């Protein structure tokens, strides 16, 4: 039901959007973000753990570029326990060298309604 479905895309870009402020840890380090369960001694893991909402498995679940110039991306798509009017969309939390971050939602499947992505992530 809708409800469900609009909890759920909520709960995602929560999950994913958490992982700012270890990113923010990373970069005043100096360190290379990662989302990773091998991460260097240069590199700095997002703490990002596995959810139920999203495609994959573990740490791989985000996708992670980083220039190690202020310039990130975090991108991780809908699927697993997530209902098939959502399962598939792409979730992106970007940041910019200036410092600001945000977030969209892309690849939306067909039966999206327009108030399953919430303000503060719209779809594109």
Request: include cysteine; proline fraction near 5%; charged fraction near 20%.
């Amino acid at each position: 039901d809708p409800f469900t479905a609009r909890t759920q895309v909520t709960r995602a870009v929560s999950e994913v959007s958490a992982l700012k402020t270890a990113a923010e840890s990373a970069i005043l380090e100096g360190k290379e973000i990662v989302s990773s369960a091998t991460p260097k001694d240069t590199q700095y893991d997002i703490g990002f753990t596995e959810s139920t909402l999203l495609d994959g498995s573990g740490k791989s679940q985000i996708q992670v570029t980083d220039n190690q110039d202020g310039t990130v991306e975090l991108v991780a798509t809908l699927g697993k326990s997530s209902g098939s009017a959502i399962k598939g969309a792409v979730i992106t939390v970007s940041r910019k060298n200036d410092g600001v971050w945000n977030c969209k939602i892309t690849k939306t499947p067909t039966a999206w309604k327009p108030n399953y992505a919430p303000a503060n992530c719209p779809k594109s």
